[PDB]
Amino acid sequence: DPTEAVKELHGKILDSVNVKRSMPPNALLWSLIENCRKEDDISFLFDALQNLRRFRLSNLRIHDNFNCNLCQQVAKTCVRVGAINHGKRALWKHNVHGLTPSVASAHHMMSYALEHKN
């Protein structure tokens, strides 16, 4: 059901976060979010988004969340894919993925809703 480009990225940084015990460089996380097409990869992106939040504090002792521009780009990834239920989770104040709510995410949701006419 998912795509191979996001699957082979996903298992790669899961192998890095669980076996090598070093955090993966953010370039491949970004190339994971740039390659999402169908409905059935954003849950694997959420699994990665959860594992990285775990590892950043667990090993590297990093307390803050993912940053605001990353919130906008994961919002635009999910809303261009079309999963509205997964996209609206990006504005949640209490989430396991560390997605700080912002305004640009709601702007992207309202832009898609403008195009979709709901």
Add this chain to the structure above:
RNA sequence: AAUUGGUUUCGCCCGAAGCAUCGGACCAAUGAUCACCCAGCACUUCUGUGUAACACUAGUCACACAAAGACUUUUGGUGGUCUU
């Protein structure tokens, strides 16, 4: 005449488990010291993407860009050495 069993002690042969002492051996971990790889805090962008004025639709600032950069410094890994 011959004959059967003990019990104690001493000299030789072999050496179960064990404690002791050496020896290679970086065996398996731990500590130290080198390097190498990500990432973070400071930063600079002619880089893309959003907020807010204005200007008629372009500019100007605020941001995070991780998108790079290059000295530092830290967290975690990796690979060598300690008269091991």
